[PDB]
Symmetry: C3
């Protein structure tokens, strides 16, 4: 299991070449801190693929979702968040929007996103899994470890 | 009277063509949730017109103010907010800025805006009432119903 | 000593030509309100110069740091913030990013910045002191007085 560590401490440990994400995210989950092995999904205003991924058991994993930063539909709501938590995921990093914000703060999982929108995403299943996602100058690679807190996100 | 309903539930009810506003607003009022018939005012760094509108009795109405999103002056402060609350308005959606943020959280009315600025708006009265206002892909039409919560805004 | 006053009240006192900053900052410190004589430092992803400035005794001063608004490195963390507080500074206005957000809320000093990033700044000492800094339509001049609260910042 991966033990969480403040991003600032990781930076002190890693040095000048630390992989720190510059993108400013908002916190939505019941946990402000989380760390775990990275899994990825790229999609667009559709969440059937990411939901299937989060349906699988996870050893405290972190799912990075690249929804092109769209604020038009909610990629994650309280249904998918609870599902993720129930299967073992420790955190979700959403390059897009979420819904049920009031409820998300009450789910024991980390959740970062750019904003909110009650409009639902489609469920065609379109998208790609296990791809590399580059956000804020950092590339999220499947298998690498993500650490997230109020300061930012570090990938090791 | 219009009974509030979470925007996410309205979306579930309405379907894919739901009129959901994509613009990200900050919450400032004592109420995080509100719903009511829409009234509108378009102006620019001037709030004499919107104040006169909010001076009239309202059956739990919602005033949508298009101030072109300016963050230069406060369209609404604790004086106008309290006035609105005292005359029956349930919520104010400000496409601009507000002042007295610390006090606004203590006024029993919903308030959304893009930001804050202590600089005051002028009081010439310039502007237009009852016009259609399109923000974040949604057109706020006088008479339609607005629902607002932590996720967004729905117009029915 | 300078006694704090709400920015809205200062605006009422000063009138239409009040110097009010339009730039939207996030609050990070233990104090949401502060006021004091202005000192300045311009730098870029380097904080050795501003740290030396904050190392000097201050009569409740306010340090305005222009880091070009970079969100790539933290200009101020809990070490520099505590140092500033320990030497007498009442507030820091950072046109850039900070780190140790969770800890900053527990330091008795005002702190405003554009965002966060755990990545550290360099310590070459590069930069300029006592320069005029113009942000959001307001010029921060050394010697002038800055007042900061939840609504904005006024310079007198």
């Amino acid at each position: 299991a991966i033990s969480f560590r403040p991003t600032a401490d990781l930076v002190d440990d890693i040095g000048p070449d630390v992989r720190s994400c510059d993108l400013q995210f908002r916190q939505f989950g019941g946990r402000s801190q989380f760390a775990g092995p990275i899994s990825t999904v790229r999609c667009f205003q559709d969440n059937a693929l990411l939901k299937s991924v989060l349906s699988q058991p996870s050893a405290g994993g972190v799912l990075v979702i690249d929804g092109a930063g769209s604020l038009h539909t909610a990629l994650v709501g309280d249904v998918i968040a609870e599902l993720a938590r129930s299967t073992g995921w420790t955190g979700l990093i959403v390059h897009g929007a979420v819904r049920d914000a009031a409820a998300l703060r009450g789910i024991d999982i980390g959740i970062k996103a750019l904003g909110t929108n009650p409009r639902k995403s489609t469920k065609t299943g379109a998208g790609e899994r296990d791809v590399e996602i580059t956000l804020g100058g950092v590339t999220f690679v499947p298998g690498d470890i993500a650490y997230s807190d109020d300061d930012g996100i570090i990938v090791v």
